Amino acid sequence: EEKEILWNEAKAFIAACYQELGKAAEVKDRLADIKSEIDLTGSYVHTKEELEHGAKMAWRNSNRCIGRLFWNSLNVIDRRDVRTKEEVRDALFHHIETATNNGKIRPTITIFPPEEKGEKQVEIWNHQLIRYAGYESDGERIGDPASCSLTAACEELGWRGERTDFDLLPLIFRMKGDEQPVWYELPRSLVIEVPITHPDIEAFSDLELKWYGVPIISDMKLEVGGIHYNAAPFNGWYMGTEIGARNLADEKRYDKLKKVASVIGIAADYNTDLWKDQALVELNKAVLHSYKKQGVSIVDHHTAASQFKRFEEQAEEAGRKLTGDWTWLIPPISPAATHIFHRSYDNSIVKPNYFYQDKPYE
């Protein structure tokens, strides 16, 4: 059943990919090559072209992603050659540097060897390559609660955080054949961070908020023609609401709205004053302002939705079915001010795609 699922996914992916690449005549012979390679080895190896286009298709098919207009410009780095933990570390460090690009963020994915027997070659423990630690002691919370369990697992491995609200977690990953992951502190020269200030309200800096420049998701599986690349970190740039309306605002995250209300000079006493809404808007204005001022890429939710509308128009004109998850595509502030809120989307799963996988800790 395994070779069979693999062969079926392979046939479908190659046909579609080669059709998109104008290589339809090559499908028959490539599929023959593949079928015998599966017969003899139990798997097959993608060409560089397939791997690159596969990763781009996978982004294009990500139902929850508002940023998909730019799917065809994904920078794909092929690291299927790595064998050692130093090589993995250096490839992750490199991804950070080249994706960051001095603030002008380049959407990039680095692809490591794929699972074999469902056996991982490289197992990345981080949720994102750059993220902040979280702690709970004396019922007192420090840092990012979403990082609590991974932070605890790193401290089990001999790492120790400074317990600021913004400790950078080390890279942490396990190699096939090793019982424990290794961890490596991030060089600070590689990590751009943005202090959050407000364009008009000077007191806003009293909150001492900041966030990191580049979100690099490192715990999803890329699936392409039946091959499972469980280790394939990827980044875009942030949409400002992700930081201003969720990471810094959620009660179960940094929970800053009451403090925001206070520095912007409004009472946080009555639901009918809409103080949370007002605090949310000023915090989100500050986030966009701060990234722009530092020369770090970011997009506001209005511009992002306009780009997404173009993606829809592009799909239609290319004759491709559009799929989407309305509940994730609407931004968490003023969603009815975007066109997204007012239409519906088919939430069917199309492959290639990025998928959740079980955490190796907790």
Ligand X SMILES: CCN(CCc1cccc(F)c1)Cc1cccc(NC(=N)c2cccs2)c1
Ligand Y SMILES: C[C@H](O)[C@H](O)[C@H]1CNc2nc(N)[nH]c(=O)c2N1
List residues near its own copies by CB under 8 A. Answer: 245-246, 249-250, 257, 271-274, 276-278, 280-281, 284-285, 288-289, 292, 300, 302-303, 306, 326-327, 330, 332-337, 341
Q: What does the binding site for ligand HEM look like in residue numbers (CB under 6 A)?
A: 59, 62, 64-67, 70, 74, 107, 109, 234, 236-237, 239, 242, 299, 304, 328, 354
Q: Is residue 7 among the annotated active site residues?
A: no
Binding-residue total with ligand Y (CB under 6 A):
6
Q: Looking at 7, 17, 30, 65, which residue is catalytic? A: 65
Q: Looking at 30, 60, 68, 174, which residue is catalytic? A: 68
Please, what is the minimum distance in Å from the beta carbon of residue 120 to ligand X?
A: 18
The values of phi and psi at residue 269, to 5°, are -110, -30
**One of 343, 346, 347, 359 touching ligand Y (CB under 6 A):** 343
Q: Is residue 65 among the annotated active site residues?
A: yes
The C-alpha atoms of residue 43 and residue 228 are separated, in whole angstroms, by 11
On the 0-12 / 13-18 / 19+ scale of CB atoms within 10 A, 177 is exposed
Distances (CA, A) of 123 to 35, 175, 229, 253: 28, 6, 10, 26
Which one, 328 or 361, has the nearer CB to ligand Y?
328
Taking CB positions, which residue lies at the least distance from ligand X? Answer: 236
Please, what is the minimum distance in Å from the beta carbon of residue 289 to ligand HEM?
A: 17
Cβ atoms of 233 and 124 closer than 8 Å: yes
Q: What does the binding site for ligand X look like in residue numbers (CB under 6 A)?
A: 127, 215, 217, 234-236, 238-239, 242
By CB under 6 A, the residues from 307 to 336 that bind ligand Y are 327-328
Cβ atoms of 350 and 61 closer than 8 Å: yes
Residue 70's binding partner, choosing from ligand X, Cl ion, ligand HEM, none, with beta-carbon cut-off 5 to 8 A by kind?
ligand HEM
Which one, 52 or 167, has the nearer CB to ligand HEM?
52
For residue 65, say whether it is annotated as part of any ligand binding site. yes
Please report, in range form, the residues annotated as the binding site for heme.
65
User: Catalytic site residues?
Assistant: 65, 68, 237, 242
